[PDB]
């Protein structure tokens, strides 16, 4: 080590991000840090609702008898899939909504079950976050054309063992969806927070942004997207009010001169980056520690 700099100040962070100890004069884009705790907002059209609970039970116990080996692999495994009636084929979901639940039913201490993604495009616990399907069926035996999800038995500070797998089949579509769990009291159709950075799921579109009320009286549709596919706004189907969506931290532009930051172009009224004076230009706001009396 010859010399070091801590990435603590605003100029130091720019130097660290640019991977260089010196920065040439010019303009450099940067993004403010995102809030670390985000509320959740959900908007959804009410549809014909019936709810199926997919539940997977895992239990195992050791070989009772003269040899009590704890670290050994479990021998006998009970794995059930609720309503999965063997000969009838995979347990398919017919309901519009469904929820996946996991019941780690082992009693031995320090032993815990788990399920892994495998080669499926989704995870067991993560389907509940409003994932759409055209069809989906689970089974404890291989489905021709499906995917496999390993089921594992774990011991603390010890190596784990596979104790089976869950086979899934699916197709793309908009008819079936996964939800976390019904709770009596909460409206899953229009429950949003305004002017605060929030994580949202609005009419099957997930993202992070800020929601506000706006002018627009657009008559067609319920969602409005940009060329890139990002969601720019949506309409509450009851009132007809249209809400806009803005990113939580759009990029700024810092001005550096003589190895220091002298100004910053901003999109709003704030004395950001520690500058004590802010003015307004035709297209943007400008903040700097300047006295505004120079000529060159």
């Amino acid at each position, epitope marked *: 080590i010859a010399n070091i700099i801590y990435c603590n100040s605003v100029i130091n962070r720019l130097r660290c991000d640019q991977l260089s100890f010196d920065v040439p004069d010019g303009f450099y884009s940067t993004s403010p840090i995102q809030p670390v*705790e985000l509320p959740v907002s959900i908007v959804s059209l009410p549809v014909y609702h019936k709810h199926t609970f997919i539940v997977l039970y895992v239990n195992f116990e050791h070989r*009772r008898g003269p040899g*009590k080996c*704890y670290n050994c692999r479990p021998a006998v495994i009970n794995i059930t899939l609720a309503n999965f009636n063997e000969t009838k084929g995979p347990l398919c979901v017919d309901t519009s909504h469904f929820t996946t*639940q*996991f*019941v*780690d*039913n*082992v*009693k*031995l*201490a*320090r*032993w*815990s*079950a*788990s399920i892994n993604t495998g080669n499926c495009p989704f995870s*067991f*616990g993560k389907v509940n976050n409003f994932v759409k399907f055209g069809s989906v069926c689970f089974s404890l035996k291989d489905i021709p054309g499906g995917c496999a999800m390993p089921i594992m038995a774990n011991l*603390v500070n010890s190596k784990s063992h596979n104790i089976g797998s869950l086979y899934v089949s699916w197709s793309d579509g908009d008819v079936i969806t996964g939800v976390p*769990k019904p709770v009596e009291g909460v409206s899953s159709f229009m429950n949003v927070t305004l002017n605060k950075c929030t994580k949202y799921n609005i009419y099957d579109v997930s993202g992070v942004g800020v929601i506000r009320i706006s002018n627009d009286t657009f008559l067609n549709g319920i969602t409005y997207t940009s060329t890139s596919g990002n969601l720019l706004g949506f309409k509450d189907v009851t009132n007809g009010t249209i809400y806009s969506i803005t990113p939580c931290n759009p990029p700024d532009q810092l001005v550096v001169y003589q190895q220091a930051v002298v100004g910053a172009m901003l999109s709003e009224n704030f004395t950001s980056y520690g500058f004590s004076n802010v003015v307004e230009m035709p297209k943007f706001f400008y903040a700097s520690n300047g006295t505004y009396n120079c000529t060159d």
Partner: antibody
Amino acid sequence: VQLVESGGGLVQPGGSLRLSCAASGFTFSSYAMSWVRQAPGKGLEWVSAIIGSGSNTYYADSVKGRFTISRDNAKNTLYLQMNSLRAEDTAVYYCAKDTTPRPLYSSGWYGSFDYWGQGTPVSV
Amino acid sequence: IQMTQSPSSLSASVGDRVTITCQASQDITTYLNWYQQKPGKAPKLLIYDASNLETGVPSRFSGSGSGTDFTLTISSLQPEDIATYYCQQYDNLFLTFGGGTKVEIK
């Protein structure tokens, strides 16, 4: 690993309290927690337990319907809500940590507490 | 579920071979914990699964049993072991502790 309880005191019968227990030194959301009380000069009695996620909560019959367990995984804090207290509810309350780590998407067994708090007195 | 431990109290000389039992009044198979509470302090876990010795307690302790009968033994009772011992089952999530048992030196 460390557990510290707080919120003990003296309240009239029929009152309410806000027992709290902070946790540090381990991944808090991976382990189930339970409150267990020791009446003065008596054996330990289990009061309530909550899994890591919080979907499942269990209560003993001597406390069923009167108390309410909760946990806030964002700031490693375990809570116990006491309502409609009686005379026999007076004891020292400990917050305990299970020994089996479990995935956050799972609901499972518990009962092998390896770490215990200092305990706090509650008088009525 | 109910648990009963015998004896309710006992006293033995240093280096002796104290043995304390616990019974479950119901088939518990192997799900039993053994705790130790020194006076005025929080309990500590000694044995889990009725026989698995914990990683921070000396091998002086040992536990055995199955079904309805269980037993905890101290190979050589040292002066540090004066405390109250408890057995706790976890076959049912509405778990219950025993009444305890106290040891004494002479």
